[PDB]
PDB file of all heavy atoms in Angstrom:
ATOM      1  N   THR D  24     -12.143   5.523  27.271  1.00116.61           N
ATOM      2  CA  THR D  24     -12.188   6.572  26.270  1.00116.61           C
ATOM      3  C   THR D  24     -11.240   6.232  25.124  1.00116.61           C
ATOM      4  O   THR D  24     -10.371   5.372  25.245  1.00116.61           O
ATOM      5  CB  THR D  24     -11.833   7.938  26.868  1.00116.61           C
ATOM      6  OG1 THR D  24     -12.037   8.957  25.865  1.00116.61           O
ATOM      7  CG2 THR D  24     -10.378   7.973  27.308  1.00116.61           C
ATOM      8  N   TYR D  25     -11.447   6.928  24.007  1.00114.01           N
ATOM      9  CA  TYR D  25     -10.649   6.713  22.812  1.00114.01           C
ATOM     10  C   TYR D  25      -9.390   7.574  22.854  1.00114.01           C
ATOM     11  O   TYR D  25      -9.455   8.752  23.234  1.00114.01           O
ATOM     12  CB  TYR D  25     -11.460   7.040  21.570  1.00114.01           C
ATOM     13  CG  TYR D  25     -12.610   6.094  21.308  1.00114.01           C
ATOM     14  CD1 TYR D  25     -13.927   6.471  21.541  1.00114.01           C
ATOM     15  CD2 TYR D  25     -12.381   4.823  20.793  1.00114.01           C
ATOM     16  CE1 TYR D  25     -14.965   5.600  21.298  1.00114.01           C
ATOM     17  CE2 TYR D  25     -13.414   3.941  20.554  1.00114.01           C
ATOM     18  CZ  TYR D  25     -14.703   4.356  20.794  1.00114.01           C
ATOM     19  OH  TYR D  25     -15.737   3.478  20.542  1.00114.01           O
ATOM     20  N   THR D  26      -8.266   6.992  22.462  1.00113.80           N
ATOM     21  CA  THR D  26      -6.996   7.693  22.451  1.00113.80           C
ATOM     22  C   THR D  26      -6.137   7.131  21.320  1.00113.80           C
ATOM     23  O   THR D  26      -6.647   6.417  20.440  1.00113.80           O
ATOM     24  CB  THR D  26      -6.295   7.579  23.813  1.00113.80           C
ATOM     25  OG1 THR D  26      -6.150   6.205  24.166  1.00113.80           O
ATOM     26  CG2 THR D  26      -7.112   8.302  24.894  1.00113.80           C
ATOM     27  N   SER D  27      -4.865   7.456  21.348  1.00113.78           N
ATOM     28  CA  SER D  27      -3.930   7.112  20.278  1.00113.78           C
ATOM     29  C   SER D  27      -3.147   5.861  20.626  1.00113.78           C
ATOM     30  O   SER D  27      -3.277   5.278  21.720  1.00113.78           O
ATOM     31  CB  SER D  27      -2.988   8.283  20.024  1.00113.78           C
ATOM     32  OG  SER D  27      -2.041   8.405  21.077  1.00113.78           O
ATOM     33  N   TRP D  28      -2.321   5.419  19.688  1.00112.29           N
ATOM     34  CA  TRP D  28      -1.402   4.316  19.940  1.00112.29           C
ATOM     35  C   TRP D  28      -0.254   4.758  20.831  1.00112.29           C
ATOM     36  O   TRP D  28       0.132   4.079  21.788  1.00112.29           O
ATOM     37  CB  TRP D  28      -0.871   3.754  18.636  1.00112.29           C
ATOM     38  CG  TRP D  28      -1.785   2.764  17.974  1.00112.29           C
ATOM     39  CD1 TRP D  28      -2.512   2.961  16.833  1.00112.29           C
ATOM     40  CD2 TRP D  28      -2.061   1.433  18.403  1.00112.29           C
ATOM     41  NE1 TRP D  28      -3.227   1.828  16.530  1.00112.29           N
ATOM     42  CE2 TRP D  28      -2.968   0.873  17.481  1.00112.29           C
ATOM     43  CE3 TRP D  28      -1.630   0.655  19.484  1.00112.29           C
ATOM     44  CZ2 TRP D  28      -3.448  -0.419  17.610  1.00112.29           C
ATOM     45  CZ3 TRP D  28      -2.118  -0.632  19.603  1.00112.29           C
ATOM     46  CH2 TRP D  28      -3.027  -1.154  18.674  1.00112.29           C
ATOM     47  N   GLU D  29       0.333   5.926  20.504  1.00114.53           N
ATOM     48  CA  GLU D  29       1.459   6.450  21.302  1.00114.53           C
ATOM     49  C   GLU D  29       1.121   6.478  22.785  1.00114.53           C
ATOM     50  O   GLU D  29       1.880   5.985  23.614  1.00114.53           O
ATOM     51  CB  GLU D  29       1.800   7.855  20.793  1.00114.53           C
ATOM     52  CG  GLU D  29       3.052   8.460  21.422  1.00114.53           C
ATOM     53  CD  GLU D  29       4.321   8.150  20.667  1.00114.53           C
ATOM     54  OE1 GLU D  29       4.268   7.391  19.692  1.00114.53           O
ATOM     55  OE2 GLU D  29       5.388   8.665  21.063  1.00114.53           O
ATOM     56  N   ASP D  30      -0.025   7.071  23.121  1.00115.92           N
ATOM     57  CA  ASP D  30      -0.358   7.270  24.521  1.00115.92           C
ATOM     58  C   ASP D  30      -0.532   5.937  25.263  1.00115.92           C
ATOM     59  O   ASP D  30       0.049   5.727  26.344  1.00115.92           O
ATOM     60  CB  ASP D  30      -1.636   8.087  24.641  1.00115.92           C
ATOM     61  CG  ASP D  30      -1.879   8.627  26.045  1.00115.92           C
ATOM     62  OD1 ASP D  30      -1.014   8.428  26.911  1.00115.92           O
ATOM     63  OD2 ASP D  30      -2.954   9.236  26.263  1.00115.92           O
ATOM     64  N   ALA D  31      -1.341   5.043  24.704  1.00116.85           N
ATOM     65  CA  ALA D  31      -1.594   3.761  25.357  1.00116.85           C
ATOM     66  C   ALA D  31      -0.324   2.950  25.494  1.00116.85           C
ATOM     67  O   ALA D  31      -0.065   2.344  26.544  1.00116.85           O
ATOM     68  CB  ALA D  31      -2.662   2.988  24.600  1.00116.85           C
ATOM     69  N   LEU D  32       0.482   2.904  24.430  1.00118.04           N
ATOM     70  CA  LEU D  32       1.726   2.160  24.500  1.00118.04           C
ATOM     71  C   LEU D  32       2.690   2.770  25.492  1.00118.04           C
ATOM     72  O   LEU D  32       3.440   2.044  26.162  1.00118.04           O
ATOM     73  CB  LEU D  32       2.365   2.051  23.128  1.00118.04           C
ATOM     74  CG  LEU D  32       1.595   1.264  22.064  1.00118.04           C
ATOM     75  CD1 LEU D  32       2.449   1.050  20.838  1.00118.04           C
ATOM     76  CD2 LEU D  32       1.102  -0.072  22.623  1.00118.04           C
ATOM     77  N   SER D  33       2.680   4.097  25.653  1.00116.99           N
ATOM     78  CA  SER D  33       3.511   4.727  26.664  1.00116.99           C
ATOM     79  C   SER D  33       3.063   4.331  28.069  1.00116.99           C
ATOM     80  O   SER D  33       3.910   4.025  28.928  1.00116.99           O
ATOM     81  CB  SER D  33       3.484   6.243  26.493  1.00116.99           C
ATOM     82  OG  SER D  33       4.135   6.630  25.295  1.00116.99           O
ATOM     83  N   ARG D  34       1.749   4.363  28.305  1.00115.20           N
ATOM     84  CA  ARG D  34       1.243   3.923  29.598  1.00115.20           C
ATOM     85  C   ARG D  34       1.691   2.486  29.905  1.00115.20           C
ATOM     86  O   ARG D  34       2.231   2.190  30.984  1.00115.20           O
ATOM     87  CB  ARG D  34      -0.280   3.973  29.630  1.00115.20           C
ATOM     88  CG  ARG D  34      -0.875   5.329  29.283  1.00115.20           C
ATOM     89  CD  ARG D  34      -2.191   5.524  30.002  1.00115.20           C
ATOM     90  NE  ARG D  34      -2.813   6.801  29.686  1.00115.20           N
ATOM     91  CZ  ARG D  34      -3.921   7.247  30.264  1.00115.20           C
ATOM     92  NH1 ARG D  34      -4.531   6.534  31.214  1.00115.20           N
ATOM     93  NH2 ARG D  34      -4.426   8.419  29.920  1.00115.20           N
ATOM     94  N   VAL D  35       1.494   1.588  28.940  1.00112.05           N
ATOM     95  CA  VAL D  35       1.831   0.185  29.129  1.00112.05           C
ATOM     96  C   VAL D  35       3.337   0.027  29.335  1.00112.05           C
ATOM     97  O   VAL D  35       3.769  -0.798  30.152  1.00112.05           O
ATOM     98  CB  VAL D  35       1.333  -0.665  27.954  1.00112.05           C
ATOM     99  CG1 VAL D  35       1.932  -2.042  28.016  1.00112.05           C
ATOM    100  CG2 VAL D  35      -0.186  -0.724  27.964  1.00112.05           C
ATOM    101  N   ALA D  36       4.142   0.810  28.608  1.00114.07           N
ATOM    102  CA  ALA D  36       5.581   0.677  28.741  1.00114.07           C
ATOM    103  C   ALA D  36       6.065   1.152  30.102  1.00114.07           C
ATOM    104  O   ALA D  36       6.964   0.560  30.698  1.00114.07           O
ATOM    105  CB  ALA D  36       6.274   1.450  27.621  1.00114.07           C
ATOM    106  N   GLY D  37       5.462   2.212  30.621  1.00112.98           N
ATOM    107  CA  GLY D  37       5.783   2.641  31.983  1.00112.98           C
ATOM    108  C   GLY D  37       5.463   1.552  32.987  1.00112.98           C
ATOM    109  O   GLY D  37       6.331   1.139  33.783  1.00112.98           O
ATOM    110  N   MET D  38       4.217   1.101  32.966  1.00111.89           N
ATOM    111  CA  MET D  38       3.801   0.070  33.906  1.00111.89           C
ATOM    112  C   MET D  38       4.701  -1.167  33.799  1.00111.89           C
ATOM    113  O   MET D  38       5.029  -1.789  34.809  1.00111.89           O
ATOM    114  CB  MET D  38       2.346  -0.298  33.664  1.00111.89           C
ATOM    115  CG  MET D  38       1.366   0.595  34.429  1.00111.89           C
ATOM    116  SD  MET D  38       1.405   0.347  36.198  1.00111.89           S
ATOM    117  CE  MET D  38       0.202   1.566  36.730  1.00111.89           C
ATOM    118  N   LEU D  39       5.107  -1.507  32.585  1.00111.67           N
ATOM    119  CA  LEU D  39       5.995  -2.652  32.385  1.00111.67           C
ATOM    120  C   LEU D  39       7.370  -2.392  32.962  1.00111.67           C
ATOM    121  O   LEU D  39       8.008  -3.272  33.539  1.00111.67           O
ATOM    122  CB  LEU D  39       6.067  -3.012  30.919  1.00111.67           C
ATOM    123  CG  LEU D  39       6.749  -4.330  30.539  1.00111.67           C
ATOM    124  CD1 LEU D  39       6.031  -5.497  31.166  1.00111.67           C
ATOM    125  CD2 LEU D  39       6.768  -4.449  29.033  1.00111.67           C
ATOM    126  N   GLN D  40       7.867  -1.159  32.803  1.00107.20           N
ATOM    127  CA  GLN D  40       9.171  -0.810  33.327  1.00107.20           C
ATOM    128  C   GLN D  40       9.209  -0.929  34.838  1.00107.20           C
ATOM    129  O   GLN D  40      10.222  -1.341  35.416  1.00107.20           O
ATOM    130  CB  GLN D  40       9.553   0.612  32.907  1.00107.20           C
ATOM    131  CG  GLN D  40      10.178   0.701  31.527  1.00107.20           C
ATOM    132  CD  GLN D  40      11.470  -0.080  31.423  1.00107.20           C
ATOM    133  OE1 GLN D  40      12.516   0.337  31.902  1.00107.20           O
ATOM    134  NE2 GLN D  40      11.405  -1.237  30.765  1.00107.20           N
ATOM    135  N   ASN D  41       8.097  -0.578  35.520  1.00106.67           N
ATOM    136  CA  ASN D  41       8.125  -0.608  36.973  1.00106.67           C
ATOM    137  C   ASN D  41       7.809  -1.983  37.561  1.00106.67           C
ATOM    138  O   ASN D  41       7.700  -2.087  38.794  1.00106.67           O
ATOM    139  CB  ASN D  41       7.162   0.457  37.531  1.00106.67           C
ATOM    140  CG  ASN D  41       5.694   0.074  37.367  1.00106.67           C
ATOM    141  OD1 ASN D  41       5.352  -1.082  37.245  1.00106.67           O
ATOM    142  ND2 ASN D  41       4.848   1.093  37.383  1.00106.67           N
ATOM    143  N   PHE D  42       7.648  -3.019  36.747  1.00108.43           N
ATOM    144  CA  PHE D  42       7.391  -4.369  37.229  1.00108.43           C
ATOM    145  C   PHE D  42       8.437  -5.351  36.721  1.00108.43           C
ATOM    146  O   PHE D  42       9.129  -5.099  35.729  1.00108.43           O
ATOM    147  CB  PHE D  42       6.000  -4.863  36.826  1.00108.43           C
ATOM    148  CG  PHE D  42       4.865  -4.181  37.545  1.00108.43           C
ATOM    149  CD1 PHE D  42       3.935  -3.467  36.849  1.00108.43           C
ATOM    150  CD2 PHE D  42       4.740  -4.290  38.915  1.00108.43           C
ATOM    151  CE1 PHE D  42       2.894  -2.839  37.498  1.00108.43           C
ATOM    152  CE2 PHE D  42       3.715  -3.666  39.583  1.00108.43           C
ATOM    153  CZ  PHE D  42       2.784  -2.938  38.868  1.00108.43           C
TER     154      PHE D  42
END
Side-chain angles (χ1 to χ4, degrees):
Chain D
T24 187
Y25 292 106
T26 56
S27 72
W28 277 109
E29 186 90 356
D30 193 5
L32 295 190
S33 292
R34 305 210 181 186
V35 168
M38 274 291 179
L39 190 60
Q40 275 300 284
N41 73 24
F42 289 119

